[PDB]
């Protein structure tokens with residue numbers, strides 16, 4: 001690690017620590033994720049993260065550059081991205097993120113997610129803190145979980161998970177992304193729940209309590225209760241007042257209750273909302 005200078009801690013959990021560093025020789029600016037190695041016939045669990053990053057090489061996925069084994073430590077070296085979308089949303093809350101940028105970011109996120117999904121990989125925890133932007137207008141998927149190896153906000157959690165589904169589909173990530181879309185536009189989290197029930201009922205109150213017509217199978221899910229509160233769906237025009245027709249349409253398809261009817265990543269990319277998509281640079 002002798003070439004890494006200006007090293008400063010930027011993240012930490014029980015399993016990982018993350019730093020910003022600058023290679024003093026190459027000038028490359030990097031993020032370093034430190035993992036402690038235990039005693040090693042079962043594969044060492046850091047291999048999963050490395051494998052996924054290698055497999056998911058893509059312009060809108062965080063880029064693993066190197067792996068450095070030193071003492072009883074492994075350092076994953078990443079290309080450095082300026083900040084996360086959460087920080088960008090907070091910095092842009094007075095004025096809002098311009099619509100051309102929201103559109104570019106949603107498009108890019110859909111491209112990264114379509115790539116994951118084409119490899120049968122589910123993200124499962126999409127949220128602003130797991131999305132990284134650079135100075136040049138790109139946004140990239142990451143998973144900044146530092147609690148454990150690859151192998152808790154509920155705000156972006158799909159309703160089927162909340163209702164006890166044993167099998168997650170690619171639709172769970174589309175739901176999370178719909179919520180993120182809405183949040184970019186309104187400047188506030190769409191479903192900011194503080195527990196499983198509060199989260200579920202926030203969804204029901206905005207979108208209406210689902211029934212067998214809207215979501216065949218809903219009443220048979222493990223944690224469904226026929227005594228659930230019954231709300232009628234709100235005017236979606238009032239849910240995301242700033243969004244135009246094309247925007248509302250796309251969002252309503254990302255937020256379809258039925259995971260089998262929820263729009264896919266690939267099909268979202270062809271929505272008319274994206275017809276005039278460009279690549280604006282954020283002001284940072």
Ligand SMILES: CN1CCN(Cc2ccc(NC(=O)Nc3ccc(Oc4ccnc(N)n4)cc3)cc2C(F)(F)F)CC1
Nearest residue numbers: 018031033052056078079080081122123124141142143144
């Ligand atoms: C169940 N799911 C299975 C598939 N998984 C894929 C998966 C798995 C692991 C990872 N790892 C990961 O981002 N590390 C990771 C993320 C951020 C980080 O810190 C950085 C990096 C760059 N700049 C700045 N400022 N700070 C360091 C290190 C990333 C993904 C991704 F991007 F594809 F989503 C997600 C989980």
Ligand SMILES: CN1CCN(Cc2ccc(NC(=O)Nc3ccc(Oc4ccnc(N)n4)cc3)cc2C(F)(F)F)CC1
Nearest residue numbers: 197200201204205209223224225226227228229230231232
């Ligand atoms: C239009 N309006 C809709 C809302 N209405 C009130 C209303 C009506 C019905 C309900 N029903 C409801 O929480 N059931 C309900 C919720 C959870 C549950 O699951 C549990 C409980 C304990 N342990 C475990 N493991 N699992 C069982 C059962 C809750 C409300 C509330 F909270 F909003 F006040 C008034 C009229």
